[PDB]
Amino acid sequence: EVKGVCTEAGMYALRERRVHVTQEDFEMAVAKVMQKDSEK
Amino acid sequence: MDDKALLVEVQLLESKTYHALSNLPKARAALTSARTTANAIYCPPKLQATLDMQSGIIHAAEEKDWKTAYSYFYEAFEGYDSIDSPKAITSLKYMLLCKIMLNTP
Amino acid sequence: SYDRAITVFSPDGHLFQVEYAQEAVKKGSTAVGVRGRDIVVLGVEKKSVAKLQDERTVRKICALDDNVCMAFAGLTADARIVINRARVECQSHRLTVEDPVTVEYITRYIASLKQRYTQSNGRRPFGISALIVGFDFDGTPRLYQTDPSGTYHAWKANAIGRGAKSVREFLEKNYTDEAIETDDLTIKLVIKALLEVVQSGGKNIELAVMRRDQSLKILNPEEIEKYVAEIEKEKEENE
Amino acid sequence: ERGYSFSLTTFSPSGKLVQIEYALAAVAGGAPSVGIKAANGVVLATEKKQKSILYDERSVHKVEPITKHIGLVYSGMGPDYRVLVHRARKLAQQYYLVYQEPIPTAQLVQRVASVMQEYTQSGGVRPFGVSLLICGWNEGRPYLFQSDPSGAYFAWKATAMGKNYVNGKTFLEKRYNEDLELEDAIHTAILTLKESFEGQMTEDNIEVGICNEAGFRRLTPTEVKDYLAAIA
Amino acid sequence: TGYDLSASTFSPDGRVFQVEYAMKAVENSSTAIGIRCKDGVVFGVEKLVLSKLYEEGSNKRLFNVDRHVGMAVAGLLADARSLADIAREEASNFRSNFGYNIPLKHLADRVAMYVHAYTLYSAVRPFGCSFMLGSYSVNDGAQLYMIDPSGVSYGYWGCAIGKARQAAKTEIEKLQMKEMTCRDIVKEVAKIIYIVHDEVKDKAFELELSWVGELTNGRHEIVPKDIREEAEKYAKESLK
Amino acid sequence: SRRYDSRTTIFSPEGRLYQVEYAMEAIGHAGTCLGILANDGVLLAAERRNIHKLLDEVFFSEKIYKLNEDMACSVAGITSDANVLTNELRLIAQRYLLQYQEPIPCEQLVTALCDIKQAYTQFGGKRPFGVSLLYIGWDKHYGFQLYQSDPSGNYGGWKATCIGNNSAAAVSMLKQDYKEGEMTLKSALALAIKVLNKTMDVSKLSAEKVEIATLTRENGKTVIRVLKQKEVEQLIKKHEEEEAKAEREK
Amino acid sequence: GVILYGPPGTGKTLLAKAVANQTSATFLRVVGSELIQKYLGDGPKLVRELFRVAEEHAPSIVFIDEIDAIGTKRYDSNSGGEREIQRTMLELLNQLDGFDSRGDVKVIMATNRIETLDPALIRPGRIDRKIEFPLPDEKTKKRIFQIHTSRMTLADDVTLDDLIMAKDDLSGADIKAICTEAGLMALRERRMKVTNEDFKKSKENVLYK
Amino acid sequence: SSAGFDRHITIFSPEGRLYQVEYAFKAINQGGLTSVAVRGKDCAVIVTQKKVPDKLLDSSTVTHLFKITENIGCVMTGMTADSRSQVQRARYEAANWKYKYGYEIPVDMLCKRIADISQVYTQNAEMRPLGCCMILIGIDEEQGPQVYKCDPAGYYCGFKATAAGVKQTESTSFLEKKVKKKFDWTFEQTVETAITCLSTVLSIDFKPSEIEVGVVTVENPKFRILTEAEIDAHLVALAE
Ligand SMILES: Nc1ncnc2c1ncn2[C@@H]1O[C@H](COP(=O)(O)OP(=O)(O)OP(=O)(O)O)[C@@H](O)[C@H]1O
Numbered sequence A: 001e002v003k004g005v006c007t008e009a010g011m012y013a014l015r016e017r018r019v020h021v022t023q024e025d026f027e028m029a030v031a032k033v034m035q036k037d038s039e040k
Numbered sequence B: 001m002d003d004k005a006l007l008v009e010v011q012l013l014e015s016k017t018y019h020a021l022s023n024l025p026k027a028r029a030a031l032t033s034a035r036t037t038a039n040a041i042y043c044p045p046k047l048q049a050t051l052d053m054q055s056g057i058i059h060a061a062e063e064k065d066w067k068t069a070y071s072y073f074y075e076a077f078e079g080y081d082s083i084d085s086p087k088a089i090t091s092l093k094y095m096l097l098c099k100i101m102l103n104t105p
Numbered sequence C: 001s002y003d004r005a006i007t008v009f010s011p012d013g014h015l016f017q018v019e020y021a022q023e024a025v026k027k028g029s030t031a032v033g034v035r036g037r038d039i040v041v042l043g044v045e046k047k048s049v050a051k052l053q054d055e056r057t058v059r060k061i062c063a064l065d066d067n068v069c070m071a072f073a074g075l076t077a078d079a080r081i082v083i084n085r086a087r088v089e090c091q092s093h094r095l096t097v098e099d100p101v102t103v104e105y106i107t108r109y110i111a112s113l114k115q116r117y118t119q120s121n122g123r124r125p126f127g128i129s130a131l132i133v134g135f136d137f138d139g140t141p142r143l144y145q146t147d148p149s150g151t152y153h154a155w156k157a158n159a160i161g162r163g164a165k166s167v168r169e170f171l172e173k174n175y176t177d178e179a180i181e182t183d184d185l186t187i188k189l190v191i192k193a194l195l196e197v198v199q200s201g202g203k204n205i206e207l208a209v210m211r212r213d214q215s216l217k218i219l220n221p222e223e224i225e226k227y228v229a230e231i232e233k234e235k236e237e238n239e
Numbered sequence D: 001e002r003g004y005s006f007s008l009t010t011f012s013p014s015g016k017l018v019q020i021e022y023a024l025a026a027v028a029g030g031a032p033s034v035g036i037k038a039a040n041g042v043v044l045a046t047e048k049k050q051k052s053i054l055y056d057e058r059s060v061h062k063v064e065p066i067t068k069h070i071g072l073v074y075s076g077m078g079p080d081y082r083v084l085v086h087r088a089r090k091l092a093q094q095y096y097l098v099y100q101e102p103i104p105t106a107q108l109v110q111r112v113a114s115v116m117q118e119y120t121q122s123g124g125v126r127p128f129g130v131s132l133l134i135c136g137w138n139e140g141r142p143y144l145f146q147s148d149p150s151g152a153y154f155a156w157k158a159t160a161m162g163k164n165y166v167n168g169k170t171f172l173e174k175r176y177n178e179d180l181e182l183e184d185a186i187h188t189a190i191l192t193l194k195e196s197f198e199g200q201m202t203e204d205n206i207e208v209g210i211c212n213e214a215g216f217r218r219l220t221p222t223e224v225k226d227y228l229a230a231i232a
Numbered sequence E: 001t002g003y004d005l006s007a008s009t010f011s012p013d014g015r016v017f018q019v020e021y022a023m024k025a026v027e028n029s030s031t032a033i034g035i036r037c038k039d040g041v042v043f044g045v046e047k048l049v050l051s052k053l054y055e056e057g058s059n060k061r062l063f064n065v066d067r068h069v070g071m072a073v074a075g076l077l078a079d080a081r082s083l084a085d086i087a088r089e090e091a092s093n094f095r096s097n098f099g100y101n102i103p104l105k106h107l108a109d110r111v112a113m114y115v116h117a118y119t120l121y122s123a124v125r126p127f128g129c130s131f132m133l134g135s136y137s138v139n140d141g142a143q144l145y146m147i148d149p150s151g152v153s154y155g156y157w158g159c160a161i162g163k164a165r166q167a168a169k170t171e172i173e174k175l176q177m178k179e180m181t182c183r184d185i186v187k188e189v190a191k192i193i194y195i196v197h198d199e200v201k202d203k204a205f206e207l208e209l210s211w212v213g214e215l216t217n218g219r220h221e222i223v224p225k226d227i228r229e230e231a232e233k234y235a236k237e238s239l240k
Numbered sequence F: 001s002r003r004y005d006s007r008t009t010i011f012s013p014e015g016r017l018y019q020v021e022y023a024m025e026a027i028g029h030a031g032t033c034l035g036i037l038a039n040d041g042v043l044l045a046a047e048r049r050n051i052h053k054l055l056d057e058v059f060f061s062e063k064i065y066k067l068n069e070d071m072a073c074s075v076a077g078i079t080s081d082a083n084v085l086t087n088e089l090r091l092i093a094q095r096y097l098l099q100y101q102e103p104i105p106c107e108q109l110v111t112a113l114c115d116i117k118q119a120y121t122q123f124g125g126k127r128p129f130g131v132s133l134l135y136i137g138w139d140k141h142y143g144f145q146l147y148q149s150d151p152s153g154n155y156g157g158w159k160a161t162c163i164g165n166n167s168a169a170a171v172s173m174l175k176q177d178y179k180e181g182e183m184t185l186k187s188a189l190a191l192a193i194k195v196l197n198k199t200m201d202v203s204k205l206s207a208e209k210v211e212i213a214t215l216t217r218e219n220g221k222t223v224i225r226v227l228k229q230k231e232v233e234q235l236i237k238k239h240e241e242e243e244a245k246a247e248r249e250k
Numbered sequence G: 001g002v003i004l005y006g007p008p009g010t011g012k013t014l015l016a017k018a019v020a021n022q023t024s025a026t027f028l029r030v031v032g033s034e035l036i037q038k039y040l041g042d043g044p045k046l047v048r049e050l051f052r053v054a055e056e057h058a059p060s061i062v063f064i065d066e067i068d069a070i071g072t073k074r075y076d077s078n079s080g081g082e083r084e085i086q087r088t089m090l091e092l093l094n095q096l097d098g099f100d101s102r103g104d105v106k107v108i109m110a111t112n113r114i115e116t117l118d119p120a121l122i123r124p125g126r127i128d129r130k131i132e133f134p135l136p137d138e139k140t141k142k143r144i145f146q147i148h149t150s151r152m153t154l155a156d157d158v159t160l161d162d163l164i165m166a167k168d169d170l171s172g173a174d175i176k177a178i179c180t181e182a183g184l185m186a187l188r189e190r191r192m193k194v195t196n197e198d199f200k201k202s203k204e205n206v207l208y209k
Numbered sequence H: 001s002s003a004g005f006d007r008h009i010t011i012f013s014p015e016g017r018l019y020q021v022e023y024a025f026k027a028i029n030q031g032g033l034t035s036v037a038v039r040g041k042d043c044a045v046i047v048t049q050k051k052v053p054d055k056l057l058d059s060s061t062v063t064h065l066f067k068i069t070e071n072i073g074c075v076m077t078g079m080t081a082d083s084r085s086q087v088q089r090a091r092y093e094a095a096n097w098k099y100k101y102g103y104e105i106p107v108d109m110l111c112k113r114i115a116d117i118s119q120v121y122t123q124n125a126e127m128r129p130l131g132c133c134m135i136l137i138g139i140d141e142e143q144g145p146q147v148y149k150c151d152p153a154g155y156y157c158g159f160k161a162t163a164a165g166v167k168q169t170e171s172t173s174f175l176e177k178k179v180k181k182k183f184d185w186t187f188e189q190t191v192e193t194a195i196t197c198l199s200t201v202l203s204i205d206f207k208p209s210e211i212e213v214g215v216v217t218v219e220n221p222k223f224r225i226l227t228e229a230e231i232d233a234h235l236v237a238l239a240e
């Protein structure tokens, strides 16, 4: 899931059209990947 | 305690009161903390559009990317559609002020 | 009331549950017994000590009366309930006919208890064999054994348990008249016999002699160390 | 006639009693039910949906009293429940005809669970398919116990049985503490049954019984609508 | 398979085959018909002569349960007279306890529950017999009941059990039993069991008739010889 | 009816019998109990299994059952079968006391139960008990005693025995550290925390994960004391203090 | 015919290597697990062409290892269920005592679950000698430690007799498992000889887990 | 889904199911028969059909309505031999209530004693669990009328409208639309809404000889069976 987060953290920076990944994209990404940990 | 949904409200409410009392970077932080909290609730049925508005407020409070800030107020209005007429009619203001700010009259 | 025939005939005339029980005997520890003309000597081997247990609770030589000892092999759970039923019968004989129980009489009680129990409904047969050793009235030392089918059977020397064919084949080439000459000389037959079995180099053997007037007398592992020295010492010099 | 007189519950070669394992699967497919003790009394709550509008919901009851001060719910199959209720009704009476004292809640679970163990070993029977939750206030301190079809029992602070019980126990772990009142425990017991119910939770879809020092009682559907109001 | 060995197991579509297998043993017994007239019940049993060595009057398939109740059986004969013993014993305990002769709606109820009790367990088998009960009372009229091996009983104006069951009760409804007295019935009982069982399968057979009503004063007994010779005089007129 | 019977009583063609060996296979998993004695006193160290954060922790113990006024037992295996055996030999000791007006010797209480347990392995067409259990106690004939039962029905006296999930790992270490008749009831307590440090895969020895009860002889008391959870953890760290010194100095 | 049976790890496969050392005949080996196939009829076809190969060479030895595994384990790759295993065994039951002229082919079989397989295959005529292997005795265990520690630089710290009765019923396979793993603990510390505490932590690693 | 003898006797499947009971629910459907019970404001009506295929059979002995006690009647579905044995228990258990306790048994306490007996058959692995159903009606004081169903699993519940048999699911879909419009129910309306239930499900539009109606009312709490003349009174008033 570490690569599950870090690859998905680029999508947050891309969906708001940035060119640098910020430190609030990762903490936005952890709360989605660990949500599926809480799913089944 | 048990709840998770009401944490979204008080973080979003603090996001209202640092910007209204003129403190942008602390309002940036509390808005961000409500982003990473609302990413785990299964049903934000109406609170998403409430969060979609002030995602566009603070991002337009620095005037960096008007086009993406326009996209927040679009989704903030689509959530408000036909269920909340006081909050919907103010949502036309923030999308068309940004569109004039986009210089497409 | 569980009513079901457990022991039935085979299509060639065997009782399968009986001869399956004879293999439970064939992996219990070895028990050897000979008789002298004045003192009997029987002793189990393969004590298999783990040096953290009470040595008296693991015993397999018990007494039914003053005159009757008993050794066994097989599984120990079924053994100590056959013993406790035999202690009751040899005690109720004294309320009847006043003399103590002859050693032949108590084996007919055990074998007839063991037979009809391969005949009843809903009962697997016993999985033990026994050696009953006693010097009766008028001082006649003799011994018997008990097949799990229930055939009491007298002997001059015998051995049951794991590795019983090799020991019985050893005794037939070794049981002379002068081997039972002295009381300390008959014991040298048994300790030579159990050493020709599963190893038991003075640490796993437990003899128990009876001099036709005493009770059973277990020698501690000092004379067995003394006897195994001289039993090897005669073998040290002849070859 | 007569019986069978042989156990049809044997050990697997892996060392597991298979019929008891299968009986727990019938317990897990039952209606969900939660139970919480909080410092002055115990709240039992269950979830009762009729299959259609034709059923009379005020005819049968899940929550049952055993004596003045002991209540009992289940999560399993229906007709097996009514057997060991009537058995437990009688066991409280032979204790009372001897000692002239209401039975302690610990001693009742000693004797109900000893029935179910005796019933999973004897000849020609299959084990029960229910689990139980037993409450009561004996000598001030309240109690909450849970049995199983095997015959064991436990002492819970809060638990959940039935469907989604592994999600109920995680929900209670983030909500329950040591210091709650009885009416606070009611609001968090309806909040955990709302995790798995249907769309509408009315005054007749659930059934709640409570204990106090005043004794066990079962809530009428009037105030159950009051607790269901101002919920979630 | 495996669902049809015991009587304690349903099928995967929900029926017991041990009862249905035992019903199939009834259609190897020959034929027993019985119809009730206006004022009585007349039984009738056609009886196979297996060999010449047996005696005329052997192994009667037509019993006598109480003073007024009659029984005609079709099935496995050892099970038939076993049911005839408990039914004869049940009527004795009614009179010894309640003082009067047992009625038929109660008598066939007590026997059928005893038959039903052997279709529940693996320890016993179901009976292989179907039979009929008929009687007459002055306060009740005539009665006619029938019991299958499953334990189901009903009333009839006329019934038939044996090999050719449908081929026998085809001609029963041609009659008019609502108005006929039990004298013309005896000729008509024998006629409809002559048109059945062609002489290809059986060489020779035997008529056996029974008879109850107020003409018999309520008692059950066999017909006299002269009356059934009239019915056997009425035999060879069905060839036209 | 004979098609549905499972024949839990007959032998196997290889001589042994399958049904209790499956039960002695189930006694391998699900629990850990051990005992030790060399002097005045005897202890039972048991490892708790259900360590969930929502339980009341009542009934004075979990796997320790006081049988007589001067002996107790630790149990392992199927817990529902355990409760029936416990209140079965609990009144064997009382009907002895009713008959002789004297407390029961600890050995012939074990032989009385192990005849009941043996009978289910032998007739009746019945599932045996999947329960093995220890016995501590005192009597005037031999003093402090220690016994072990088996689901087959045979018992034995011991000095140190475990029936845990890694019992064979524990017994191999018990006969590497011992002394016959000199391990007093502080070195035995120190040796008990060392053994279940090893056989428990859950490390660091949480003080709520174990149970320890001692049986010491006071003049007319024979005090059976389940020691509380305030003196366990000081005995835990006492093992932890010396092991850092013994490793670093070697 | 010759069959070899006993507890697992007592040296059944080990003795067949010694026969393959000594003999001059061609030696054929097949595991019993790989007799079962995935297509219908492909199983008995493989047995017919196994004894085809064995006869068409020489005097030869056919070694079939773990033949209980044809019956114990069920695999979902096999389309036919147990009634395709059976048709495979009927073909093998032919090839041992068919009516065809057999020739010079010896058959060696090995298993550890001897009570499971078909007694029609173990009758005299197809298999004559039945050889049991026991667990190693405590004076033969000492022989095995002498063998597997022959060419290793054994330091004189150790005493082999403490290692013998460590487990009461340790097989011959357990001894080699201790002796190899104790050597692996030496190479973690670049040593050349094996000390006593190597064997102390060896049996903790091998046996007790 | 299956392991062991779980298809054959009453033990658990690996899925937690048990098949011998749910094989027995569809032994009810082999009768080819359907009964409907409707509770009113001051009455309770059972209606069921009867299928008489022969003219030789007595039409007065095929009643599925049974009088349990003087104030409690019942209808039986499922197979006939097991249904009539279960009525024999209910007549017996009601008489022991009056002898032990000195007053008339309530109808729910009677249905509890029947379901407890039926529970034992699916509890021991020896008996066959009686594939027939059970519907009771009766008047209870301070409760009005009330209807109860008992199935062979041991389950029971009080209903407001009830169907049982082959066309059970189509009839309950009819009645739940009828009851949720919340019309008030007189005596004649409950009789009309119970005949028109199975007259539209089965689509027969029958004459008064195929059905039979039992009823109880709080002005005459006797369980009474309607005459064919007065069934015809309700039937011609149904066609306006
Ligand atoms: N008696 C023995 N003498 C020497 N080596 C032995 C002995 N027994 C076992 N071994 C060692 O154990 C290893 C495995 O033995 P082997 O596989 O032949 O036993 P097995 O019974 O055939 O095993 P399996 O039952 O799994 O087929 C061999 O490599 C051998 O070195």
Ligand SMILES: [Mg+2]
Residues within 6 Å of the ligand: G009, G011, G012, G013, G014
């Ligand atoms: Mg091998």
